[model samples]
Target: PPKIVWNEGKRRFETEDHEAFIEYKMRNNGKVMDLVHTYVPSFKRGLGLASHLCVAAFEHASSHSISIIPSCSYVSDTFLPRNPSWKPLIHSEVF
Candidate 1:
């Protein structure tokens, strides 16, 4: 399991693996459903850190049945293309 933390100072959530860090935003409107802007450090790029974070985020959302608005371009362009199963969850406004 990933150790997730909510950093109030940054207004975002984060988790980490030895090689990389994952950060994301959670924007809620009364309900827990919200937008998620996720990213992995550039130094950690191409090692699937973004995909891992997206999986974790999707798992968290599925557990709570919350809708997602993926504002992160990486998630929209890179992650979703490889993981089509989760594409429906992506906010259509992204393009």
Candidate 2:
């Protein structure tokens, strides 16, 4: 299992290696979390790291009562489709 850590100062969840991460921007005055991007190095593509990053991000938002906007393609297109349980956490007011 990979260890994921949150860098609140940078607004991202990255692994110890720091090669892959999910970056988000707080919106609506910190009440909403807009997941803007997820990046994994080409060599790391098949490791399920992206999903782990999203799970960390979504769980953090859910715990804090922060709604989400999945602006990133991987999040909106791939992640959510596979993880429907997390969809309720999406922000109500879409931008």
Candidate 3:
């Protein structure tokens, strides 16, 4: 498993990769979250680290009772397509 660290100061989840990270921000004054960017280096693409970031984000959201808006296409169009359980966490208006 990848070591996903929540950088509270930077407002992003980070891994050992300095170039590859998932960026996010709270919306509605912290009630909702926008998962806006995710980067997985070309060399690191197939190891499943992006999904590890997703799991970390989801765990954080579940504890905080936060909803998510998958703004980044990598998140919306790619990563999320594999998980059916994330339906309840998504902001339905974006659909």
- Give the TM-scores of the predictions, in the order they appear: 0.63, 0.94, 0.89
Clashing pairs in 2: none
Candidate 1 lDDT over 1-95, as tens digits, reads 45655444764455634333334555565223343456666776666666766777676666766667666676667777888898666555554
Please report the TM-score between candidate 2 and the true structure: 0.94
Q: Tens digits of per-residue lDDT for model 3 on 24-95?
A: 999998988889888788988887877778777877887899989998777788767888688688877877
Quality of model 3 by C-alpha lDDT: 0.81
Error of 1 at 60 (Å): 0.6
Better of 2 and 3 by lDDT: 2
Please give the distance, in angstroms, between residue 93's alpha carbon in candidate 2 and its true position after superposition.
3.0
List ranges where model 2 is wrong by over 4 Å: none
Q: Identify the candidate with maximal lDDT.
A: 2
Candidate 1 wrongly placed segments (more than 4 Å): 1-13, 17-36, 91-95
Q: Model 3 TM-score?
A: 0.89
